[PDB]
């Protein structure tokens, strides 16, 4: 019973979380997952400020109200070569990665590693935070409050 959560640098408190190395998070699960990091789904304004500080990914993820990819450098295989906060318009499917926003993080680029999952609750799952540099933090718990996400 294990879940891997790959996380990034934070930019103005905004970071990306990928579950189990594939697009696998529902919108309800995303809100619960950010809550386990004492975080919330970013607003569009918070994501645009993060982009301006250097944030970009090549993966779709939830924010409040939309599914997006922040892009700085045009790349043909990331958001169809667009720059800015690219918004997903048409998709058949419901599961993506997520973005989270931690208001207590540093104001600009914070590329230190994540070493805690502070607000997870008691549960049976081994949850492992995987940083881009490979460093890991694991703890037994749960963060999903909706049965359909388990
Ligand atoms: C170039 C990017 C996609 N590579 C990347 O993120 N990785 C190789 C991951 C670092 C930690 S891991 O989760 O074990 C695999």
UniProtKB/Swiss-Prot annotation:
Post-translational modification: N-glycosylated.
Glycosylation sites: 6, 38, 81, 92, 102
Annotated hyaluronan binding sites: 22, 59-60, 86
Tissue: Expressed in the intestinal epithelium.
Disulfide bonds: 9-111, 34-100, 58-78
Domain Link residues, every copy: 13-102
Location(s), subcellular: Cell membrane; Cell projection, Microvillus; Secreted
Domain notes from UniProt: The lectin-like LINK domain is responsible for hyaluronan binding.
Reported function: Cell-surface receptor that plays a role in cell-cell interactions, cell adhesion and migration, helping them to sense and respond to changes in the tissue microenvironment. Participates thereby in a wide variety of cellular functions including the activation, recirculation and homing of T-lymphocytes, hematopoiesis, inflammation and response to bacterial infection.
SUBUNIT field: Interacts with PKN2. Interacts with TIAM1 and TIAM2. Interacts with HA, as well as other glycosaminoglycans, collagen, laminin, and fibronectin via its N-terminal segment. Interacts with UNC119. Interacts with PDPN (via extracellular domain); this interaction is required for PDPN-mediated directional migration and regulation of lamellipodia extension/stabilization during cell spreading and migration. Interacts with RDX, EZR and MSN (via FERM domain). Interacts with EGFR. Interacts with CD74; this complex is essential for the MIF-induced signaling cascade that results in B cell survival.
Protein name as catalogued: CD44 antigen
Species of origin: Mus musculus (Mouse)
């Amino acid at each position: 019973n294990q879940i891997d959560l790959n996380v990034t640098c934070r930019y103005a408190g905004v970071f990306h979380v990928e579950k189990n190395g594939r697009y696998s998070i529902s919108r309800t699960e995303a809100a619960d997952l950010c809550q386990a990091f004492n975080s919330t789904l970013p607003t569009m304004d918070q994501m645009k400020l993060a982009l301006s500080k250097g944030f970009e990914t090549c993966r779709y993820g939830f924010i409040e109200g939309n599914v997006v990819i922040p892009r700085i450098h045009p790349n043909a295989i990331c958001a169809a070569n667009h720059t800015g906060v690219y918004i997903l318009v048409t998709s058949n499917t419901s599961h993506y990665d997520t973005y989270c926003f931690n208001a207590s993080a540093p104001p600009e680029e914070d590329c230190t590693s994540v070493t805690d999952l502070p607000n997870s609750f008691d549960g049976p799952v081994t949850i492992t935070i995987v940083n881009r540099d490979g460093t890991r933090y694991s703890k037994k718990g749960e963060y999903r409050t909706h049965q359909e996400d388990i």
